[PDB]
Amino acid sequence: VFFSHWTSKYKERNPTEIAYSEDIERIIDSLVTDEITKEEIIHFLFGNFCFHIETMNDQHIADKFKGYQSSCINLKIEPKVDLADLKDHLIQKQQIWESLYGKHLEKIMLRIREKKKKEKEIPDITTAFNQNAAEYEEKYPNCFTNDLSETKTNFSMTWSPSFEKINNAIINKFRESFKSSSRVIYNSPYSTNKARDITNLVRLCLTELSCLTRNKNEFCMKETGRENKTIYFKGLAVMNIHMKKLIRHDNEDSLSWCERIKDSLFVLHNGDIREEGKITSVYNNYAKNPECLYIQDSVLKTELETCKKINKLCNDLAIYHYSEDMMQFSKGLMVADRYMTKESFKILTTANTSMMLLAFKSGVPYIALHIVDEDMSDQFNICYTKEIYSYFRNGSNYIYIMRPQRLNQVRLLSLFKTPSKVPVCFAQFSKKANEMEKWLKNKDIEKVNVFSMTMTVKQILINIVFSSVMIGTVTKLSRMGIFDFMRYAGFLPLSDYSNIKEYIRDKFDPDITNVADIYFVNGIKKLLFRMEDLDIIGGITDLNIKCPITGSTLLTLEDLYNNVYLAIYMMPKSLHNHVHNLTSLLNVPAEWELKFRKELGFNIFEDIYPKKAMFDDKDLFSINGALNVKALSDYYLGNIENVGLMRSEIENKEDFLSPCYKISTLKSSKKCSQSNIISTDEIIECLQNAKIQDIENWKGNNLAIIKGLIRTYNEEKNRLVEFFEDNCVNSLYLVEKLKEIINSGSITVGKSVTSKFIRNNHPLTVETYLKTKLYYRNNVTVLKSKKVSEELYDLVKQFHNMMEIDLDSVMNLGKGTEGKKHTFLQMLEFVMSKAKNVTGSVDFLVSVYLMSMKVKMMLYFIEHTFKHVAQSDPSEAISISGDNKIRALSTLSLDTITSYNDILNKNSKKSRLAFLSADQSKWSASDLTYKYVLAIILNPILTTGEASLMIECILMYVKLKKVCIPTDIFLNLRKAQGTFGQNETAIGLLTKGLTTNTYPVSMNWLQGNLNYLSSVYHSCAMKAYHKTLECYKDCDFQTRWIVHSDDNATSLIASGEVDKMLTDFSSSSLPEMLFRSIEAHFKSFCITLNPKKSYASSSEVEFISERIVNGAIIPLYCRHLANCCTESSHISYFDDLMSLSIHVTMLLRKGCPNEVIPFAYGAVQVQALSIYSMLPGEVNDSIRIFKKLGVSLKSNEIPTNMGGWLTSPIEPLSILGPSSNDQIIYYNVIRDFLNKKSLEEVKDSVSSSSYLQMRFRELKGKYEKGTLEEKDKKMIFLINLFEKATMLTQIIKLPNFINENALNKMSSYKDFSKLYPNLKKNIASSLEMESVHDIMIKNPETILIAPLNDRDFLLSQLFMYTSPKLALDRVLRSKARTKMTYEENMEKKILEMLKFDLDSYCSFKTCVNLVIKDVNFSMLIPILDSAYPCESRKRDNYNFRWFQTEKWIPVVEGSPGLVVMHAVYGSNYIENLGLKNIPLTDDSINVLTSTFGTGLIMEDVKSLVKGKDSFETEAFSNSNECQRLVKACNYMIAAQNRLLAINTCFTRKSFPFYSKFNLGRGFISNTLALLSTIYSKEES
């Protein structure tokens, strides 16, 4: 039934003995155990498919039976030719392969016994900490001790003396203060020639060099006195233009010192007089009056004023002003990174009154000048005691000179995100102190103050301020390590975790190189001490202590989990270097594969080999072998139902019969990085045609080849000589010509300049230098990152026999839909036909992970034929609908466990429950890929030949896989080994003396490559666990498991003889035996479960995040709250606000608490404004530009595309999403201009025809009379906004680095520039342009629609060329010209865009019609204005009970299918605003190419000259607005042609061509029930 298509051409192929390798017979020889012999094991292995016969076709079963006879003939065993004889074998199959379960249970019993033995017994976590400090002490001796003066700076580079005074003023103020008599006092670091040199340097550069001055702020030292030269050089030599020192975790002097640091920081921060600013202005707009963010203001009267209280607190200790100084700090250092020299230096003053930084030339160091008054200086001395060089007195004032530090560019980025980081820190943490709650709920807004708290609330405010600064201002890898440590040290509040001592004993990194993280060490030590002293409300009986904020009297467990997790989740990704992360990501697979190779027993030199039969229940890397195929067989039998139906689902949904450009994965641009190099004949032929008489005429590729070869001769003469000997017969001629070229002297040579040779040169010079450098009788070739679709295009060219792209070779064949076409596995058979050929394994490379188009094709094939095994399995959670399916699956799992236990607690003997949260140790590397070879050959999905195909590509994927080291880091470590090391590390013995560029990893299948497959066999492993655990006698176990790759959530219920299986399992509790049994079993399937990141609880569920306890979910919003503040898209201001407002809406829908929403609005606004469109109070504003231009548009309806602010209400944000703000702006202006009251009046005003026409007619009359009002002004403003334009677009497009000088890197652009001549590079040109537009106008589906078939793809890639660290980039480009300037681009855009213009009716009525025909908007507004305030199951509580209830009872009872009033929602992509912009862009492209073609035909194009029919129809199209008229006919016309691409030209030549190959017309939308995943804790 259903016509099962035979989806390959490999019908005769067999997995055994017809495949290219001979792995499978020794797979048998490794899989043979006792009492199971060769004939039976291969008979099972290739006849397990007959369990699925009742839903298979006769031709499929005949093919599989012939493959079975072929395999039995190949293996020299007796074939079975009868179904009845195969069942007569299945009986002994069932009895002997169900016997493996019994032996396996005793094997994991024994493994549990010795794993319970010999490990160690740690009595207490203090003893574990002492053991860890001990093993670090004989790891590296003479560390630690109480000598803090050799430690690093504890407050880092974060300095804020609060200033009580009033750019060029500050420098002359400091010059006035620095010219007095010297009374300099030095200090000990914790109560001096370098300090003297720094002081002399700073008084020289203050008195004498600060007043040649460039850019008004930076200046150099060239013409001075020789003594100034000497002491300037001494200062720069002082700053230099294992050595680890540590601090023990239990130092009472350190904790007392850090307490002093805290309280003195509080006294320091209580001193600012600033009341205005930029950060203060934006956060104050969002927070002094935050009820404009709301709709139902009057239903709650204990919330808004306390949010104002935290706003007033942040104003009083000047947190926003502090953030302002850090933004000006980091921005100044960012512009200090420039072409300035080592003898030049820069003055930096922030918005504060008396800051000064003195930046010199890894990064930039700087000297500090700060002002402290007489009243409060001693506590400043205690705070800054590590980082103070000197201080001195002037009147009643104090000048402070501090220790310089060193920055990195990513550290400047992290300091630049401080205004997004620290206010939301103080906001959530102040919501997380319950004593803060009772303070601000007792006091009032006008009476909250610093000098009027109790002592304990004072001390927690000091702790909260210390936490805010030390979390938002992180720089150090020490901070990275400790924050990772309490990321992975928070599983103690529940049952047996098996890391409460041994994680700190083994995998803890006590890299505490300074102080002020000792407070966090002591806080987490207090938490773990309190937990070791021994739905669920936590802290009301535990009485624990928060880790960052101390924060006693805990309300719930959610507060502490959100506390620690926000403390983790703004930790930025890399803070070390680019090439430390890169070297680590290259060294980890090297170490894992070296461990594999050394423990199995190969050496570095031989082939990889598949099996020597120790792949049988060993401890390091082995599977059980005879168990795994039975587990996979029962998994397939119990999971896949109606195999042919889901196979047809594979063919239809996953496009197994469609061309490869129909998949977004293989047509999208995420970079393939394949291998290319200049051919070897080109270099020698360029040398032979190199003419000495044209030394000065060397331009182009020849000069670059010459530079590469002269570098090769200058460095490695012998390597050049052997290269020319192995590549040229006239090697003496080449050598003597090289010597004659060096004897000319008209060229330039280069010394060792590290990566600057790669930087300031053409890449051709460096790739020919590497090619002539590392010639070792092989073909070294590094890879390049192409555009994926370009390699698909190249493969299409090679598959249609075009090795050279001929112009006539494409339009001759492939006419219409019924023309020539290809399929995905025909293409992949070409792929394997090319890969089987001996080509030096240049296909099988990975460059970092970036894997080639080759491996992308076959592992795409494997992973994406293995999806539908997973969507047929309800206990598997990688086949997910983004986010809601994960939470829904985990929670129906857990509440089925709770219901199951609650229905068998009645009248049973005993009942216990336990669950384990597990993350495996190394999913990519510690697993076995040879288990997968055993896994497709039992899949009943496939036939013989395609199963053989994926066996072949997997065994090549593990036989020829290699990782390529980058050239630059290769050169650095080669030079380091040459001059200093003379030996190498674990990466250094895989390559012979580092002589090879590329090194092999095989068993580490690289991460992300096989994601669905490994999770499918993870679920199979859990099914085998259920089958094994049901085999034990005296219990009934019910396990439900939810599975991601590298992840596991495993439940279990035990009933019966719980005491005796507890003693049998050699453990004290059900979570303990669950942990040990899962560990032993998973090691029996070569799944290395991490003993540290795996905790077994009794009531708390943690799959990947968002724990849920006892049926009630912990929200875990702080991932979204932090990713609002640490990561952005970095493309433009509009799109950055769009993406971080996506994160804001996730915050709104993940159970956000009471106060932090305005601060999150402030965080997204401050981030977007600070990076991209400059925040108010300076140049490049938007509101200041509007006030300058006198636009009638008010401040709170500026559209975000030119610089508006996210001022949308919280309900339209959380319901619709990012477009709610400009959609609400458009709704308000339509409601104002049509003089209407309600949207329901706007429906029957707009839907009646001849209404918008007479409205614009009245508008035209009012404009020509000149009596315009402000509503009409705002109207015509956004009419031309939508005309010159989610609803809108980016508008102003600042162009990137123009890659027209790099477009020649693409082979497709080379193909275009070869097939059409150099006139296409940027009379003959006009006629070839006419030919190009002729072949566009003959085939409009080439450009208008995505490629339907062949003769629609490769020429589309050729013809899209017809007509013409980045966060650091345009913060200086915003103050530069891109040549005319972006701020003037704004005010000119409002200047020509404010005026009324003409024929704008199309834009006006499409804006109104889009607002009207938006569906979910049109039911959102009436319930928003028709929401009753409280009661009737709407509002009964007030403790975080409004951001669920009044958000989502009105909508998810307006959209029916719910009963609840409190739940955490994961919504779909219900709001799609992109169903008209794609029509607009498509027919605008059609209009553009038609206009260009008729422009080539003639000039002054208003009417055609009666050319052809397409020209007349395009004339009638562009007489009016072509897009608007084609939609205008497209409401009534309902042709909707089937797209045979033959009748389309027959029907009509304009309207179908730019209407119906957009695959749809303007039609209605569809709304969902918001997919409420599960309910939170119930309050009534």
Automatic annotation (TrEMBL):
Enzyme class: transferase
Record-listed E.C. numbers: 2.7.7.48
Keyword tags: Transferase
Molecular function terms from GO: RNA-directed RNA polymerase activity
Residues annotated as signal peptide: none
Highest rank taxon of the organism: Viruses
BP GO annotations: DNA-templated transcription; viral RNA genome replication
Stretches assigned to the RdRp catalytic domain: 903-1085
Protein name as annotated: RNA-directed RNA polymerase L
Organism name: Tomato spotted wilt virus (TSWV)
